[PDB]
Amino acid sequence: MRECISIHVGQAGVQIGNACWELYCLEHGIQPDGQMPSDKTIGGGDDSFNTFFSETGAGKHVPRAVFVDLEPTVIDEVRTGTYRQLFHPEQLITGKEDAANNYARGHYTIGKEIIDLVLDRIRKLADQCTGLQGFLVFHSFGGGTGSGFTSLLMERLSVDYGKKSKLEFSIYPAPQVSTAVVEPYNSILTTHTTLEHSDCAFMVDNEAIYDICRRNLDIERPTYTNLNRLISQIVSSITASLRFDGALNVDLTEFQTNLVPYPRIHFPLATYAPVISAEKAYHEQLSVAEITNACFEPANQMVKCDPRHGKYMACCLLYRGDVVPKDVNAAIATIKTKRSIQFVDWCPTGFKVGINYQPPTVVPGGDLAKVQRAVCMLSNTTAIAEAWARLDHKFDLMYAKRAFVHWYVGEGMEEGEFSEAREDMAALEKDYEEVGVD
Amino acid sequence: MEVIELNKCTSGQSFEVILKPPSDPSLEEIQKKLEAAEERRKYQEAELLKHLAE
Amino acid sequence: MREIVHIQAGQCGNQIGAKFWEVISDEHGIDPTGSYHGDSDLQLERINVYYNEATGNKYVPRAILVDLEPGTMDSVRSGPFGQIFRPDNFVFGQSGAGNNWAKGHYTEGAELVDSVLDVVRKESESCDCLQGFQLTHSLGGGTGSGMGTLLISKIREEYPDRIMNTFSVMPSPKVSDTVVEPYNATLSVHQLVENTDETYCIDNEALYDICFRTLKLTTPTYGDLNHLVSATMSGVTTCLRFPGQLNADLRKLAVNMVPFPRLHFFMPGFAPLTSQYRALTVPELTQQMFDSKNMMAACDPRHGRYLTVAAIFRGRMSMKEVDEQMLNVQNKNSSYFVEWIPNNVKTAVCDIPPRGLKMSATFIGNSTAIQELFKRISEQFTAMFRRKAFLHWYTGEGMDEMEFTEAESNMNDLVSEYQQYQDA
Amino acid sequence: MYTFVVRDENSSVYAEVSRLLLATGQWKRLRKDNPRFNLMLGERNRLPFGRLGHEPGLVQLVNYYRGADKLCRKASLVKLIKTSPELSESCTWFPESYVIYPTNLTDEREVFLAAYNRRREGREGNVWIAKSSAGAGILISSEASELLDFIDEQVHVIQKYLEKPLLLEPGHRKFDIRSWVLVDHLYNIYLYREGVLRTSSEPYNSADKTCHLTNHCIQKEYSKNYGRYEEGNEMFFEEFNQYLMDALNTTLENSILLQIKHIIRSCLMCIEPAISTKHLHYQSFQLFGFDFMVDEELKVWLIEVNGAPACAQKLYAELCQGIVDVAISSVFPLASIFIKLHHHH
Numbered sequence A: 001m002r003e004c005i006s007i008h009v010g011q012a013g014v015q016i017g018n019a020c021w022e023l024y025c026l027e028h029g030i031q032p033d034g035q036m037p038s039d040k041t042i043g044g045g046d047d048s049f050n051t052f053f054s055e056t057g058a059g060k061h062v063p064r065a066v067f068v069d070l071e072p073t074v075i076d077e078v079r080t081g082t083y084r085q086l087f088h089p090e091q092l093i094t095g096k097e098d099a100a101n102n103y104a105r106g107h108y109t110i111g112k113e114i115i116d117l118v119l120d121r122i123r124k125l126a127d128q129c130t131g132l133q134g135f136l137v138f139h140s141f142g143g144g145t146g147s148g149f150t151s152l153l154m155e156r157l158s159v160d161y162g163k164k165s166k167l168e169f170s171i172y173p174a175p176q177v178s179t180a181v182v183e184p185y186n187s188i189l190t191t192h193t194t195l196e197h198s199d200c201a202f203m204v205d206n207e208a209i210y211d212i213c214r215r216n217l218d219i220e221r222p223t224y225t226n227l228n229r230l231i232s233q234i235v236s237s238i239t240a241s242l243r244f245d246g247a248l249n250v251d252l253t254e255f256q257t258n259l260v261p262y263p264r265i266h267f268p269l270a271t272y273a274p275v276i277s278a279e280k281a282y283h284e285q286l287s288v289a290e291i292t293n294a295c296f297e298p299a300n301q302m303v304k305c306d307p308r309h310g311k312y313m314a315c316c317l318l319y320r321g322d323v324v325p326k327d328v329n330a331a332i333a334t335i336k337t338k339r340s341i342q343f344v345d346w347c348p349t350g351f352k353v354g355i356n357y358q359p360p361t362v363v364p365g366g367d368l369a370k371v372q373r374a375v376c377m378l379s380n381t382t383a384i385a386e387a388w389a390r391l392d393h394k395f396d397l398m399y400a401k402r403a404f405v406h407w408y409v410g411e412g413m414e415e416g417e418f419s420e421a422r423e424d425m426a427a428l429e430k431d432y433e434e435v436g437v438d
Numbered sequence B: 001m002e003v004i005e006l007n008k009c010t011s012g013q014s015f016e017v018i019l020k021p022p023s024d025p026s027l028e029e030i031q032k033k034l035e036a037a038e039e040r041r042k043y044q045e046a047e048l049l050k051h052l053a054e
Numbered sequence C: 001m002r003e004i005v006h007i008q009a010g011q012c013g014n015q016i017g018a019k020f021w022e023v024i025s026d027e028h029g030i031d032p033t034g035s036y037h038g039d040s041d042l043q044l045e046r047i048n049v050y051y052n053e054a055t056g057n058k059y060v061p062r063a064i065l066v067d068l069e070p071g072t073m074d075s076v077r078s079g080p081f082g083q084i085f086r087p088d089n090f091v092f093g094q095s096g097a098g099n100n101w102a103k104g105h106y107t108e109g110a111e112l113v114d115s116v117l118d119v120v121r122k123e124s125e126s127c128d129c130l131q132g133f134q135l136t137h138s139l140g141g142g143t144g145s146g147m148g149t150l151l152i153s154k155i156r157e158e159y160p161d162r163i164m165n166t167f168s169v170m171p172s173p174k175v176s177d178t179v180v181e182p183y184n185a186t187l188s189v190h191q192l193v194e195n196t197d198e199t200y201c202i203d204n205e206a207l208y209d210i211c212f213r214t215l216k217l218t219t220p221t222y223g224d225l226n227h228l229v230s231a232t233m234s235g236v237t238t239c240l241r242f243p244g245q246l247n248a249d250l251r252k253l254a255v256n257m258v259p260f261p262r263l264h265f266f267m268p269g270f271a272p273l274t275s276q277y278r279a280l281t282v283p284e285l286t287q288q289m290f291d292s293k294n295m296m297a298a299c300d301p302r303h304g305r306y307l308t309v310a311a312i313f314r315g316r317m318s319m320k321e322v323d324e325q326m327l328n329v330q331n332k333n334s335s336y337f338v339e340w341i342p343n344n345v346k347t348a349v350c351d352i353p354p355r356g357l358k359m360s361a362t363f364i365g366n367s368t369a370i371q372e373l374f375k376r377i378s379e380q381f382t383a384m385f386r387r388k389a390f391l392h393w394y395t396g397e398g399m400d401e402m403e404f405t406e407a408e409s410n411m412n413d414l415v416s417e418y419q420q421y422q423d424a
Numbered sequence D: 001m002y003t004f005v006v007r008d009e010n011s012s013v014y015a016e017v018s019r020l021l022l023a024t025g026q027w028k029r030l031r032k033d034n035p036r037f038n039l040m041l042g043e044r045n046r047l048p049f050g051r052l053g054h055e056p057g058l059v060q061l062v063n064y065y066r067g068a069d070k071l072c073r074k075a076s077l078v079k080l081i082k083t084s085p086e087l088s089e090s091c092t093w094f095p096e097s098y099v100i101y102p103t104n105l106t107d108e109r110e111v112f113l114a115a116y117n118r119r120r121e122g123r124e125g126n127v128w129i130a131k132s133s134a135g136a137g138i139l140i141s142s143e144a145s146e147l148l149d150f151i152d153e154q155v156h157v158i159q160k161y162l163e164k165p166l167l168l169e170p171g172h173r174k175f176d177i178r179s180w181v182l183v184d185h186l187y188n189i190y191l192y193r194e195g196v197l198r199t200s201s202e203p204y205n206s207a208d209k210t211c212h213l214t215n216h217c218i219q220k221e222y223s224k225n226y227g228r229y230e231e232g233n234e235m236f237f238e239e240f241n242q243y244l245m246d247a248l249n250t251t252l253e254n255s256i257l258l259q260i261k262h263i264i265r266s267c268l269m270c271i272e273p274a275i276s277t278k279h280l281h282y283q284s285f286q287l288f289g290f291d292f293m294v295d296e297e298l299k300v301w302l303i304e305v306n307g308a309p310a311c312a313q314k315l316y317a318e319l320c321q322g323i324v325d326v327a328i329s330s331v332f333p334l335a336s337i338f339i340k341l342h343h344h345h
Ligand SMILES: Nc1nc2c(ncn2[C@@H]2O[C@H](COP(=O)(O)OP(=O)(O)OP(=O)(O)O)[C@@H](O)[C@H]2O)c(=O)[nH]1
Pocket: A009, A010, A011, A012, A013, A015, A016, A069, A070, A071, A098, A099, A100, A101, A102, A106, A140, A141, A142, A143, A144, A145, A146, A147, A171, A172, A173, A174, A177, A178, A179, A180, A183, A206, A224, A227, A228, A231
């Protein structure tokens, strides 16, 4: 058994992390007070769920998580929330004034004054680990803390934990729920300084989650609670292999091996199905073929793009529920004869499939209906570069006039870091085009 | 269509299906960048105080 | 606990400032004696932003009342909510400023400014995390204009890393006290250009026109004008006083609204403006909110382009319909929004409506058309300054003509800067 | 009041469409860089499809199908027909073609020579034509050595030249047929009822490329009989149908148009899974130009598909109005000249 430490940075990271750990407890049968009746090894054990939960002598299962926010309001929700008993105060780190949607403020001004405190708290959880795989980092692209402090943290983690893997769950900015106009700036700045420190990043565009909630859940104006519950389901499907018995994606290293052949191209596209409204009294349970086919519909992707006009480098299918390998192969054979699935010539045209028999867990009273089977597809397609193209274009429009740049320069950042970050994104866009375009 | 590496357990199973064969900065450097930006903030603030002093 | 320190200076600043505290105390359930008598926890959620908590569950406004005359502040202390202010926060002289910027800024206000800063320091020392300051004043007089900008410069010297916000009342010949108002306004504008992060330009010309043309008031008074200011001030501070995600603090508002440091002068707007029991629909709120007749700056938005826009909707309404209407205005009039700042319109919704209204909308626009206001002041300034008229009131206080020339050039540069981004 | 942008100033078809949209009083044209548009008349090259459909509260439509270049390029069309089971190598309505990369750069040089030697030994007609998308550069020769050497002097394609074309009389002259096809956001295939025959004004000589190439520019510049038989070397369907009845005792519909409709359906249905925008965040339509050749036995052959076609001068008003009616107003309603080619989605 090898442990994993989760790090939640900024409002988006903390609130998503709160949703994910709530879902983990329901899946693992952990009560809000930390007690897990099914765990017969009291005070210890090296089971699969111990990769995410440490155990105390009293039987409390404590998440291996650190919550960081430069503003206390969001983490104070966790301190007084339903699962307040799960965490101890050493895991929750709060400042007093946030980064004000300014990357430079989160990275240089306020980040420098709190980076050592966060690393010391991270070191405390690392000392409880017999063998540490690495870290899962939850943050937004657009917030000042989520973009600015995360990049500083990733740099330091590569120094203090150079042999450990690091994976991201990043929230791509969407104007329908965005809180700042400079979010394209923060997204590119944090991508540039984190690119060489992240082994695998799962981008989630809030636009896609917003429309999925509106379309499939019949939510007129989705809130963060609606968005995060859906996001935690996708995160749970991605991390289920680390928390349950299995043979696919069993450690953080296997994620890079199975999804990232080229280190810079480490942004797999996630597609999830089925998303069924709980207000429907009875819904026809979708088959293995139907949910697998839905993995190739852009309307179900975490980032809206067209994989038909790109090339695949890897593809993983993560099933949860009543799924047998025979039905998966029958679905895949039919899909090949109907879908435009092009792989790069230097990679095999195949699928790595993982099945967990336990059906997905839904938070009681939530928006997602219980389903007999569900699938999350992780595909490394060059079509996800469309998100970079949209982000870079908005960066170019504002930066040509130097709009809002004085806020970053006033925090000690040099103007050249803007062009340096943009040039790195330009190279990243070129890399995607070379791989997936003839 | 070839299925390989089938591993089964109580909680589930995994396999691979093939349809076609194929055809860091140091802590010192980080601290220098953080201190360089902090110095630029101090210089800008000192200029403002100089401007206000005038 | 992100506290804001409020300062009101001069006759206009105190009269408008008093009405603002009267309006928001009603919204937060605070009575004239400082006791809370509300019925919703949303009123007290962000109460510490503007109010200090004292013994006996008393809420004392974090407000400092400044004047060079005791007259207006005596009226405030005898007003409806006069007893709620902290007695030690009344800092006043006796000589007055004589509608003279030099007296407020250099001679009379200089003698008093240190005692004001002592009260500011006392209020700031008790703040858990000070956001910054908001100042209410006029630019046409002597105390709010001259001493008010002196306070801003000295406050920035002592608190360089805090946000400076102002509600600045622009003079107009339609509602005018003295002929020297263009002089005082031009001198004050340069101070605001350098030493404030956010300035709401409240134009007495627009306030008079709204009272006359729209509200059908043949003889508007200052009280009628201040009613519009109170409603506007309540709306623009809604995101600061109630829970929310957008522009919840002064710095985040500045980051969203100010693309260039000197271009931080906002056009405020309010809806509805009814001369009354009829329910107002969400489409009606949006149309009136963006209409020039509901703007408080007397600038035509169609003569310029919107750099950034902040919209606040108050009341129980359909947020889905609010999003549709907000997107409808942008998509039907995209020519008036700059294309080099994507998604520059940000919308916030608050459940608690203002007193006497079910639905309300507050407009905060950073439009290049605000240059019309500065051009108007510049033309009035030059008409007198070319003949050196009325300058002796200022040279008698130690000022030189060169300082007027520099102030004239500074505002013309500001006008040229707005014209740069209106054609880009 | 809908909004649209224009990003192809050289498009004669959509210049008229833009003119018609403004004339309705319900369409407002924006700057070409304004993202808050309902309709984009996009550019031919590097159209930013990735930035479409990400504007909240705006249904966005574009006048091009992403991925349609596979049908509208010389080498791409040959590869698509050979490799697609729906079309197969045994495709009977497409000339035997081969993709030949220049030697200074898969490639089908040896495959082309294997079939070439069979015709040389078999005493059959062995005349081929070399062409590419980088032309205005076309060589017609019966010797394979000249064809391969010419390409070496970009990617080219060598296909069989139709040595027995249908020749109009009087004149004994060659021609080609252009059909305009509009595919809407629902992937309905609409064939414009009006076509044009771009005819050669010189007698066909099987033993000088003026009488062999039907291109309008090559006829108006290198042919001395331009406009002699028909105005602008353009014969419309009404005249051509009458000629077929008078000369060949048959109609245009039976002898030619049935095969044309079959070819259009086969090509567009083949690429439908790859380019359809049925479940996509933005919608696409596109106007296509199909160019056909007819042999002496009244068999229709497909020559090329144009992704950015122009129109005949007489037919600009009718076709452009039809584009607005079924491809633009169908998505954005305001306040038939096409033949619908029904198919299975
Ligand atoms: N999906 C999702 N997105 C969120 C959530 N909270 C914020 N965001 C997005 O994150 C972006 C803003 O970043 P935040 O995380 O709120 O800011 P921050 O990390 O706290 O940094 P500060 O500027 O210091 O406040 C916006 O684009 C929001 O749409 C959330 O709970 N769920």
